[PDB]
Design a protein around this motif. Structure first.
Motif, PDB file in Angstrom:
ATOM      1  N   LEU B  80       0.853  -1.176   0.000  1.00 40.61           N
ATOM      2  CA  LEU B  80       0.000   0.000   0.000  1.00 40.61           C
ATOM      3  C   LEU B  80       0.897   1.236   0.000  1.00 40.61           C
ATOM      4  CD1 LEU B  80      -3.165   0.697   0.541  1.00 40.61           C
ATOM      5  CD2 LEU B  80      -2.365   1.270   2.833  1.00 40.61           C
ATOM      6  N   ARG B  81       0.876   1.991  -1.095  1.00 40.56           N
ATOM      7  CA  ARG B  81       1.668   3.216  -1.190  1.00 40.56           C
ATOM      8  C   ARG B  81       0.676   4.354  -1.017  1.00 40.56           C
ATOM      9  NH1 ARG B  81       4.627   4.742  -6.765  1.00 40.56           N
ATOM     10  NH2 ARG B  81       5.976   2.980  -6.175  1.00 40.56           N
ATOM     11  N   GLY B  82       0.760   5.055   0.107  1.00 40.82           N
ATOM     12  CA  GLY B  82      -0.190   6.117   0.362  1.00 40.82           C
ATOM     13  C   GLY B  82      -1.503   5.416   0.658  1.00 40.82           C
ATOM     14  N   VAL B 271      -4.055  -1.010   9.263  1.00 39.51           N
ATOM     15  CA  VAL B 271      -3.441  -0.736  10.560  1.00 39.51           C
ATOM     16  C   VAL B 271      -2.151   0.046  10.310  1.00 39.51           C
ATOM     17  CG1 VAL B 271      -2.381  -1.726  12.623  1.00 39.51           C
ATOM     18  CG2 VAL B 271      -4.367  -2.838  11.575  1.00 39.51           C
ATOM     19  N   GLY B 272      -1.408  -0.362   9.283  1.00 39.79           N
ATOM     20  CA  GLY B 272      -0.168   0.319   8.949  1.00 39.79           C
ATOM     21  C   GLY B 272      -0.438   1.728   8.452  1.00 39.79           C
ATOM     22  N   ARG B 273      -1.504   1.872   7.672  1.00 34.31           N
ATOM     23  CA  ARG B 273      -1.907   3.166   7.129  1.00 34.31           C
ATOM     24  C   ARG B 273      -2.199   4.114   8.295  1.00 34.31           C
ATOM     25  NH1 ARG B 273       0.019   5.407   3.856  1.00 34.31           N
ATOM     26  NH2 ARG B 273      -0.021   7.182   5.315  1.00 34.31           N
ATOM     27  N   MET B 274      -2.881   3.603   9.315  1.00 36.45           N
ATOM     28  CA  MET B 274      -3.212   4.405  10.486  1.00 36.45           C
ATOM     29  C   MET B 274      -1.937   4.881  11.179  1.00 36.45           C
ATOM     30  SD  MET B 274      -3.039   3.899  14.015  1.00 36.45           S
ATOM     31  CE  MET B 274      -3.141   2.108  14.144  1.00 36.45           C
ATOM     32  N   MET B 275      -0.941   4.007  11.259  1.00 31.55           N
ATOM     33  CA  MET B 275       0.315   4.371  11.898  1.00 31.55           C
ATOM     34  C   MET B 275       1.023   5.472  11.109  1.00 31.55           C
ATOM     35  SD  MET B 275       0.801   2.804  14.786  1.00 31.55           S
ATOM     36  CE  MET B 275       2.579   2.804  15.131  1.00 31.55           C
ATOM     37  N   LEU B 276       1.017   5.357   9.787  1.00 31.41           N
ATOM     38  CA  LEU B 276       1.673   6.361   8.954  1.00 31.41           C
ATOM     39  C   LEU B 276       0.856   7.643   8.846  1.00 31.41           C
ATOM     40  CD1 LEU B 276       3.282   4.218   6.121  1.00 31.41           C
ATOM     41  CD2 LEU B 276       4.271   5.079   8.256  1.00 31.41           C
ATOM     42  N   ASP B 277      -0.370   7.610   9.362  1.00 33.37           N
ATOM     43  CA  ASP B 277      -1.243   8.783   9.356  1.00 33.37           C
ATOM     44  C   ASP B 277      -1.293   9.432  10.738  1.00 33.37           C
ATOM     45  OD1 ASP B 277      -1.948   8.763   6.662  1.00 33.37           O
ATOM     46  OD2 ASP B 277      -3.679   7.452   6.985  1.00 33.37           O
ATOM     47  N   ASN B 327      17.274   1.040  10.919  1.00 31.97           N
ATOM     48  CA  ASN B 327      18.049   1.154   9.688  1.00 31.97           C
ATOM     49  C   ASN B 327      17.936   2.545   9.078  1.00 31.97           C
ATOM     50  OD1 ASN B 327      15.620   1.299   8.247  1.00 31.97           O
ATOM     51  ND2 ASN B 327      15.785  -0.756   7.356  1.00 31.97           N
ATOM     52  N   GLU B 328      18.668   2.770   7.993  1.00 32.36           N
ATOM     53  CA  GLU B 328      18.670   4.068   7.332  1.00 32.36           C
ATOM     54  C   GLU B 328      17.290   4.555   6.903  1.00 32.36           C
ATOM     55  OE1 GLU B 328      20.406   3.949   3.227  1.00 32.36           O
ATOM     56  OE2 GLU B 328      20.797   1.844   3.711  1.00 32.36           O
ATOM     57  N   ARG B 329      16.359   3.626   6.705  1.00 34.36           N
ATOM     58  CA  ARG B 329      15.006   3.980   6.283  1.00 34.36           C
ATOM     59  C   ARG B 329      14.060   4.168   7.462  1.00 34.36           C
ATOM     60  NH1 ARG B 329      14.587   3.118   0.949  1.00 34.36           N
ATOM     61  NH2 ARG B 329      12.300   3.311   1.034  1.00 34.36           N
ATOM     62  N   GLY B 330      14.524   3.805   8.655  1.00 33.13           N
ATOM     63  CA  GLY B 330      13.694   3.919   9.841  1.00 33.13           C
ATOM     64  C   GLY B 330      12.557   2.907   9.820  1.00 33.13           C
ATOM     65  N   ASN B 331      12.772   1.777   9.151  1.00 32.37           N
ATOM     66  CA  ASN B 331      11.734   0.752   9.066  1.00 32.37           C
ATOM     67  C   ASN B 331      11.343   0.210  10.434  1.00 32.37           C
ATOM     68  OD1 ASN B 331      13.303  -0.231   6.071  1.00 32.37           O
ATOM     69  ND2 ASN B 331      11.161   0.451   6.156  1.00 32.37           N
ATOM     70  N   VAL B 332      10.043  -0.007  10.609  1.00 27.23           N
ATOM     71  CA  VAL B 332       9.495  -0.558  11.841  1.00 27.23           C
ATOM     72  C   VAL B 332       8.550  -1.649  11.367  1.00 27.23           C
ATOM     73  CG1 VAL B 332       7.993  -0.133  13.809  1.00 27.23           C
ATOM     74  CG2 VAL B 332       9.686   1.578  13.147  1.00 27.23           C
ATOM     75  N   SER B 333       8.412  -2.721  12.136  1.00 24.04           N
ATOM     76  CA  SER B 333       7.545  -3.799  11.688  1.00 24.04           C
ATOM     77  C   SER B 333       6.961  -4.661  12.785  1.00 24.04           C
ATOM     78  CB  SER B 333       8.328  -4.703  10.725  1.00 24.04           C
ATOM     79  OG  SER B 333       7.526  -5.737  10.155  1.00 24.04           O
ATOM     80  N   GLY B 334       5.767  -5.173  12.514  1.00 17.58           N
ATOM     81  CA  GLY B 334       5.149  -6.121  13.415  1.00 17.58           C
ATOM     82  C   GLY B 334       5.709  -7.401  12.810  1.00 17.58           C
ATOM     83  N   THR B 348       8.551   6.218   2.056  1.00 13.19           N
ATOM     84  CA  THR B 348       7.698   6.191   0.874  1.00 13.19           C
ATOM     85  C   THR B 348       6.215   6.202   1.240  1.00 13.19           C
ATOM     86  OG1 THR B 348       7.629   3.761   0.738  1.00 13.19           O
ATOM     87  CG2 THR B 348       9.478   4.877  -0.332  1.00 13.19           C
ATOM     88  N   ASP B 349       5.929   6.420   2.521  1.00 13.46           N
ATOM     89  CA  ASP B 349       4.556   6.450   3.021  1.00 13.46           C
ATOM     90  C   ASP B 349       3.861   5.148   2.632  1.00 13.46           C
ATOM     91  OD1 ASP B 349       2.458   7.768   4.377  1.00 13.46           O
ATOM     92  OD2 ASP B 349       1.544   8.367   2.471  1.00 13.46           O
ATOM     93  N   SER B 350       4.613   4.054   2.676  1.00 15.97           N
ATOM     94  CA  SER B 350       4.077   2.755   2.292  1.00 15.97           C
ATOM     95  C   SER B 350       4.030   1.716   3.398  1.00 15.97           C
ATOM     96  CB  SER B 350       4.874   2.190   1.116  1.00 15.97           C
ATOM     97  OG  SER B 350       4.773   3.038  -0.013  1.00 15.97           O
ATOM     98  N   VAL B 351       3.137   0.751   3.211  1.00 12.51           N
ATOM     99  CA  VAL B 351       2.952  -0.347   4.148  1.00 12.51           C
ATOM    100  C   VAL B 351       3.088  -1.631   3.346  1.00 12.51           C
ATOM    101  CG1 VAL B 351       1.358  -1.487   5.748  1.00 12.51           C
ATOM    102  CG2 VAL B 351       1.304   1.007   5.493  1.00 12.51           C
ATOM    103  N   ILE B 352       3.847  -2.585   3.868  1.00 18.43           N
ATOM    104  CA  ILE B 352       4.004  -3.862   3.194  1.00 18.43           C
ATOM    105  C   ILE B 352       3.498  -4.951   4.114  1.00 18.43           C
ATOM    106  CG2 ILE B 352       5.544  -5.552   2.148  1.00 18.43           C
ATOM    107  CD1 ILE B 352       7.545  -3.332   1.634  1.00 18.43           C
TER     108      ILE B 352
END
Lengths: 384, 384
Positions: B80-82, B271-277, B327-334, B348-352
């Motif tokens: 999900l990008r954006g 859920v990821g979208r909510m976190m990035l929002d 990491n350099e991208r600041g990635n966080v993950s469940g 990239t305002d994305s959720v994988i």
């Protein structure tokens, strides 16, 4: 031994997975996508209190209908006249799209699946059960025909005293996972069925849930499909239903065909609509015109000796997993304990669904009240 | 004793109903509408074979992506990008709308619910666990703060050798219904938690599923809601999800907060979208901007001594039920065993979302491959 059964998933070994192996490969690929089939699970609502009463039409003829429904612990009530929903009621706490256990109304759905296979020539009701399930040799199902199972005209030593753990009724539940297992209990539903015995006599009606599970077993042997899948393929998937139905399964994944199906009231009505449409559903023909005709015609009246039914319906009978009132309206109905009914009123081309939760599974009182409501509603639909 | 717990239904006695009492009044009114919570059940499809690959965009940058997904036993994959789904993949046999077990990704959802209550001032992370669950006195949770539970910085004698039935890891599963009970086992998850002990030290990260269930217990005591309901009210019902999520429950109806949630890949992405929002969802704010900021910021690096994580992410950490790569991208993950990830790529305002079924719960090999895919996909989303 109970012979070959449909694998839980493609290539699965017999009985796999179990509650202790679902996390292991190769079972986990399937299990992770169907965990509810292994472990009790609750829904986490995607939606963010009061009874819904839309009796409208019949409300004028039956002013105290809502009160009567409350008195009979009604959870969901729906009247389908033709293709139109003309009356609805849902208790506080039960949403219109919520699913409700059907109990023995599940039997009528199973009989429908059997009927579909008869129409395909895959099942010959005149053949002995052992023609399809040889493993039932030596049991009460050794000798009787598939039709005798469908009409429940087999004498079976089946203790219905639930309070007694030794009773066949309680043992049936434990074998299927509806109750906690006891040391010595059959491992699954198939095994339980093989333990049943009788004096060998047939011809007289004896309501016994084991009969329906034998039908489901036959369905599996003839199609190679898990009953859960056969119920979908031969019936549910052709109804254009709003929601999937669900069915409890035992440790082998065998659906409790005799009483474990749950669905919405509106969707259950689609089954009735199919019956009143000569066996045809939106997704295609489910059963033959002849099968439906035979259901509406009823079974042998002389075989019906259940006073609990005949005291109210003197000319009543039972056939192909449906109760036939034999009343002036020709009413036929699927019936389940605690107040479940899939009632057909061919005269008005209507279907009445009533899903309830009476405190007791059965009492003359509850049935008198319930049948009074179903009959009054049916009559309220008559042209005047 | 484990104290007061939310009733299965309004007015229900403690622990009611059980597998042996759900058919009895007053339990049956509730049970008949929620049987899946008591007995394993299968879906009967309302719908009448091949993998679905819609990688489109990133496909050009990652030509062998589908093969890489197959190699990592991918069941569902979504990017999900954006607010737009830019890539999707579902193995043969798994529909886009099918639900998949999240395993420990479930923990991140639980932490979110806790965060919502912190935002309401109902939970103070600085307070000891015993302020909310006094019954945990005398256990390893007697002394530590709620924040230490959230960050999993409590030393606990917790044997992770699953093969050993005496291990805390296997006992945890049996207590919750994920495995067959053994004589002597705690009756439910609450009881199991009270048996845990430790040397009293805190501050160092120790991944332990028991921590998340303690959080859910705290949620129940503070809200009076069953965790199943709190998860819906504080999170799921605000996502505008396509389908309900599900969660396994133990014999008391307590949801297995640490790993029993199942949902669709698309819904998990919400859920990821909510976190990035910043903590806001379509149905309203779920958590505060500050809470989200603290999750993205990471936990104390010095507390993170798990080489299984730091060998790949040297500056990694863990906080509020989320793994922070640093990491350099600041990635966080469940993250959840067998390959489950709710991966956030803020750049990239994305959720994988990647839901899988590796044969093994964990191996360096699988994680190396999985993280390689997540990182490559994240980079493929960068502006060029």
């Amino acid at each position: 031994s109970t012979g070959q059964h449909p694998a839980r998933y493609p290539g699965a070994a017999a009985g796999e997975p179990t509650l202790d192996s679902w996390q292991e490969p190769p079972h986990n690929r399937w299990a992770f996508a169907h965990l509810g089939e292994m472990v009790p699970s609750a829904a986490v609502s995607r939606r963010p209190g009061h009874a819904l009463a839309r009796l409208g039409a019949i409300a004028a003829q039956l002013p105290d209908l809502e009160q009567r429904l409350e008195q009979t612990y009604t959870d969901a009530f729906l009247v389908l006249r033709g293709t139109e929903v003309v009356a609805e009621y849902y208790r506080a706490g039960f949403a219109p799209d919520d699913r409700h256990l059907l109990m023995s109304v599940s039997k009528s759905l199973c009989g429908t699946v059997v009927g579909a296979l008869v129409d395909e020539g895959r099942i010959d009701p005149a053949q002995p059960v052992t023609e399809y399930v040889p493993e039932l040799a030596g049991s009460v199902y050794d000798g009787p025909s598939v039709l005798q199972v469908l009409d429940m005209q087999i004498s079976i030593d089946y203790n219905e005293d639930y309070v007694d753990p030794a009773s066949e009724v309680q043992t049936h539940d434990r074998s299927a996972g509806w109750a906690t297992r006891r040391h010595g209990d059959p491992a699954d539903t198939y095994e339980f069925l093989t333990t049943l015995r009788g004096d060998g006599s047939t011809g007289e009606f004896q309501y016994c849930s084991a009969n329906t599970d034998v039908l489901a077993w036959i369905v599996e042997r003839v199609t190679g499909l898990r009953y859960v899948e056969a119920l979908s393929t031969y019936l549910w998937a052709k109804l254009d239903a709003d929601r999937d139905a669900t069915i409890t399964v035992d440790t082998t994944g065998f659906g409790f065909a005799n009483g474990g199906v749950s669905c919405t009231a509106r969707d259950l009505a689609r089954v009735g609509r199919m019956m009143l449409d000569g066996g045809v559903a939106p997704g295609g023909r489910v059963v033959s015109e002849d099968w439906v005709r035979r259901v509406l015609a009823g079974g042998s009246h002389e075989a019906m000796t259940d006073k609990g039914f005949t005291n109210t319906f003197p000319d009543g009978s039972y056939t192909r997993q449906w109760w036939c009132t034999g009343n002036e309206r020709g009413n036929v109905s699927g019936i389940g304990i605690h107040g479940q009914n899939l009632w057909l009123d061919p005269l008005t081309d209507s279907v009445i669904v009533k899903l309830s939760s009476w405190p007791d599974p059965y009492t003359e009182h509850w049935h008198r009240l319930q049948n009074g409501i179903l009959l009054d509603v049916s009559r309220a639909l008559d042209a005047v």
